Amino acid sequence: AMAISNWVNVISDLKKIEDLIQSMHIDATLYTESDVHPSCKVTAMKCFLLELQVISLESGDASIHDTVENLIILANNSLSSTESGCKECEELEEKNIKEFLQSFVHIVQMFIN
């Protein structure tokens, strides 16, 4: 069977989340690394993943939680198969959900081969 990278499925879960939240009113601001240096990418990916969970929690929605759960399962998988002096997540700029998810796609493109 064809091996398809987990990050592809991560990208389409992000798109799914974008569509699902359009009907809702999530107004959280989230730590967002808009320009990830390659040298800190795993640190940054971990922040994105943590902050996606806030979107999930605040949603109170089954489909969103299920999509988020599937996304982070997929991500942790890939990340299984040391960066020093990277910013903590709380050092990042906070942005709205739309910019957050756009930047999440951007980092995911870095992990695709």
Place this chain on the structure above:
Amino acid sequence: SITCPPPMSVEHADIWVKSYSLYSRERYICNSGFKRKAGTSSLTECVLNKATNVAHWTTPSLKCIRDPALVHQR
């Protein structure tokens, strides 16, 4: 016509409530020198104990941590 009481305190955070009305959504904000822990939520909501007709604010998962920006200059 149900409304919520003053919200409970969250360590290192404060809150100003725009509406005490049922299902109102509000947010705790970490004090100066503290930051919301990534992956924790500041949202609280006024919800109903169904078989009590009494409303309360949900506990947020928020955790306020020392600002990492500062933790390095002392």
